[PDB]
């Protein structure tokens, strides 16, 4: 539950329950400011660690 209640919808969608996370993220209209290891791997950038 703490993995799915994070501020980033990309990490929560890549972890588990992609349909529900993407539905609540699309209705809430939220942004992903790319703060973490898992998002920069998907994007293709240098990880911030």
């Amino acid at each position: 539950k703490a993995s799915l209640n994070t501020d980033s919808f990309i990490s929560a969608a890549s972890f588990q329950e992609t349909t529900r996370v993407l539905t609540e993220a699309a209705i809430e209209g939220k942004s992903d400011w790319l703060r973490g290891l898992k998002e920069n791997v998907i994007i293709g950038r240098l990880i911030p660690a």
Binding site: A2, F15, R35, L37, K38
Partner: protein, 49 residues
Amino acid sequence: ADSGYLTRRLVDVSQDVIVREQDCGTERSLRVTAMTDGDQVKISLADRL
């Protein structure tokens, strides 16, 4: 499969814990005693410090 699923959940719950700053400036502390189950110890205090 149970072991690997637990490992993947533990990775996803804490993939954003990076050491960012040098000091936070807090006064709160954690009390450490020797772990004992009965009369004999399991981990001593010197190993826990």
